[PDB]
């Protein structure tokens, strides 16, 4: 119907929102995984530089791996949220014709619903760091700073990290707190009186647990890690030959990737995700579902 | 051991070399 028209504007709103939130994601990762402070400790050459390098090994890989997961999560979660609320706004708009109808999603409901995003940027992020840090530790912990990896050996290390992460809890758990949680930690100022918000959060949870969401997120994640690998390729060059670098040389390269992964200047990375046709098709199914009676 | 030392001091220079670019039409 007249939906595709409302759907098209709603998509760019979602894009504005991602770009708008990346500084916040980046800043949180960089404060919680502050490698630049460890490199500053090494610049004023200290005694325990070995100890600091083994730290930086973990932090650099954790930061970049979390950067990729959380950025892909931000994109797909916002596509869900914005298309759920958009669909409700559409129906509220269609119900102004009718009489004895009240609006379901007024501005204060929209805003409380959308604030659920704070979990991903907040405690979910922190728990993701914890889980990924544990994986990097397992995979790279006992690997000498002297060990060489080609670009593709590095790719393989990243896959071993991913397999450890994607098989204690489902990924849905970092985007949304568990239902057995006080309502208050799930949206800003959320209480049992916020019936409509609670209902939107239920339907969001349905979406996040559905297999179609699993598919879209997996596709986004594969792309993200591919693109991360592509951004690093030039540093495994010298002129068309590729080299295996020792791990200590790979650390600074991995470390710098957050600036591309979480780039509001839509790095080719984020715009990459925002233009994936798979993501766009998923969004349209979400919107068709929530905008029909 | 001592190959280590020159590797760690060399790697340190690579943090600045790894960051992204700036742009002219802004």
The rounded distance, in Å, linking the Cα atoms of A6 and A4 is 6
d(CA A195, CA A217): 29
- The helix (run of H) or strand (run of E) holding residue A273 is helix A268-274
Residue from the list B4, B15, B20 with its beta carbon closest to the beta carbon of A255: B15
> Does residue B1 sit at the A interface (CB-CB below 8 Å)?
no
Q: What is the CA radius of gyration of chain B?
A: 15
The Cα angle at residue A184 between residues A181 and A187, in degrees rounded to 5? 105
Instruction: Identify whether the C-beta of residue A213 lies closer than 8 Å to the C-beta of residue A115.
Output: no
> Helices A49-94 and A151-165 sit at what angle, rounded to 10 degrees?
60
Q: Which H/E stretch holds residue A53?
A: helix A49-94
Q: Do residues A149 and A244 lie in contact, with contact meaning Cβ atoms separated by under 8 Å? A: yes
Which position has the token pair 């999560």? Answer: A73
Contact criterion met (CB < 8 Å) for A256 and B18: yes
Q: What phi and psi values does residue A210 have, to the nearest 5 degrees?
A: -80, 155
**What is the spatial distance between Cα A46 and Cα A118, in angstroms, rounded to a whole number?**
39
**Does residue A261 belong to the interface with chain B, where contact is any CB pair within 8 Å?**
no
Residue A26 near residue A262, CB atoms below 8 Å: yes
Of the candidates A36, A43, A53, the beta carbon closest to that of B8 is on A53
> Tokens in use for A223?
């792309």
- Give the Cα separation of B26 and B24 in Å (integer): 6
The structure was resolved to a resolution in Å of 2.5
Residue B8 to residue A249, Cβ atoms within 8 A: no
DSSP A130-145: HHHHHHHHHHHTTS-T
Q: Which residue of A53, A235, A260 is in closest CB contact with B20?
A: A260
Domain-wise residue ranges, chain A: 1-293
Interface contact flag, B14 A267, Cβ < 8 Å: no
**Gap between the Cα atoms of B13 and A292, Å rounded:** 58
* CA–CA gap between residue A103 and residue A86 (Å, rounded): 13
Gap from A123 CA to chain B (nearest CA, Å):
28
Any bridge partners for residue A246, and if so which?
Answer: A148
Residue A132 tokens, joined: 């990924």
Type and span of the H or E element at A149: strand A148-149
* Burial (CB count <10 Å: 0-12, 13-18, 19+), residue A33: buried
- The answer to whether the Cα torsion of A6, A216, A76, A210 is positive or negative is positive
Identify how the structure was determined: X-ray
Q: For residue A252, what are its two tokens?
A: 């600074």
**Chain B residue numbers touching A230 (CB-CB < 8 A):** none
Placement of tokens 């939130």 in the chain: A21
């Amino acid at each position: 119907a007249r939906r595709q028209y409302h759907f098209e504007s709603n998509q760019r709103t979602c894009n504005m929102t991602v770009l708008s939130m990346l500084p916040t994601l980046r800043e949180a990762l960089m404060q919680q995984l502050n490698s630049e402070s460890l490199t500053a400790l090494l610049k004023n050459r200290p005694s325990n530089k070995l100890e600091i390098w083994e730290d930086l090994k973990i932090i650099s890989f954790t930061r970049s791996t979390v950067a990729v997961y959380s950025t892909c999560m931000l994109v797909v979660l916002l596509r869900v949220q914005l298309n759920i609320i958009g669909g409700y706004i559409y129906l509220d708009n269609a119900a102004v014709g009718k009489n004895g109808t009240t609006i379901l999603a007024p501005p204060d409901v929209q805003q409380q619903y959308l604030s659920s995003i704070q979990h991903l940027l907040g405690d979910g992020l922190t728990e993701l760091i914890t889980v990924i840090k544990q994986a990097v530790q397992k995979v790279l912990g006992s690997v000498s700073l002297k060990h060489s990896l080609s670009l593709l050996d590095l790719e393989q290390k990243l896959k071993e990290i991913r397999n450890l992460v994607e098989q204690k809890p489902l990924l849905c758990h970092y985007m949304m707190p568990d239902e057995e949680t006080p309502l208050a930690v799930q949206a800003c100022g959320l209480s049992p009186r916020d019936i409509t918000t609670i209902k939107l959060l239920n339907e969001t949870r349905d979406m996040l647990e559905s297999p179609d969401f699993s598919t879209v997120l997996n596709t986004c994640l594969n792309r993200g890690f591919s693109r991360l690998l592509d951004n690093m390729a030039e540093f495994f060059r010298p002129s068309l030959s590729s080299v295996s670098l020792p791990l200590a040389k790979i650390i600074p390269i991995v470390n710098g990737q957050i600036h591309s992964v979480c780039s509001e200047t839509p790095s080719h990375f984020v715009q990459d995700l925002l233009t994936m046709e798979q993501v766009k098709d998923f969004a349209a199914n979400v919107y068709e579902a929530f905008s029909t009676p | 051991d001592r190959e280590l030392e020159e590797l760690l001091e060399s790697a340190l220079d690579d943090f600045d070399k790894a960051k992204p670019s700036p742009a002219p039409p802004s």
